[PDB]
């Protein structure tokens, strides 16, 4: 699917691809230590050492896939995320999709879909003021995830 982010949107992403690339070399030269390694009582270091490699490699992957297709989006375009608005969101690392509607604090309910968030949680003040392509870290009832803004609508 086509790939929208704003120049925020996009920086953000690629400081996050760099970052992670920091660690894969990191993680690298872990898992060669160990592989060079004489004292082996057994091999769960090892094994640990490639799970992480993977984990970061797997990041890497999606933050490269997302960043190489992305159409840089016109600053202030589209609607911008106020009370009453339905957002859909895109895990960037996942591409897990989320929906969410931004209202008043009597009329939050985490458990509706769209969650109905209100506007003065973590999360609502996060989302508040922000546009299609925006990428963000939010607070959600699943703990700390981020997530690109794909749609904004009543």
């Not at 997302?66 to 957002?87: F, K, Q």
């Not at 392509?133 to 981020?146: C, I, Q, Y």
């Amino acid at each position: 699917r086509e790939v929208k982010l704003t120049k925020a949107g996009y920086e953000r992403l690629m400081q996050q691809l760099e970052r992670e690339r920091e660690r894969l070399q990191e993680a690298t030269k872990i898992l060669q230590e160990l592989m060079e390694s004489s004292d082996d009582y057994d091999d769960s270091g090892l094994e640990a050492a490639k799970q992480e490699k993977a984990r970061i490699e797997a990041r890497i992957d999606s933050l490269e896939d997302i960043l190489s297709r992305a159409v840089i989006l016109e600053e202030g375009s589209g609607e911008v995320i106020g009370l009453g608005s339905v957002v859909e969101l895109e895990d960037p690392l996942s591409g897990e999709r989320l929906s969410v509607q931004v209202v008043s604090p009597a009329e939050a309910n985490v458990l509706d879909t769209p969650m109905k968030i209100s506007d003065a949680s973590p999360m609502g003040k996060a989302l508040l003021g922000h546009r299609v392509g925006d990428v963000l870290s939010l607070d959600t009832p699943k703990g700390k995830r981020e997530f690109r803004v794909v749609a904004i609508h009543g």
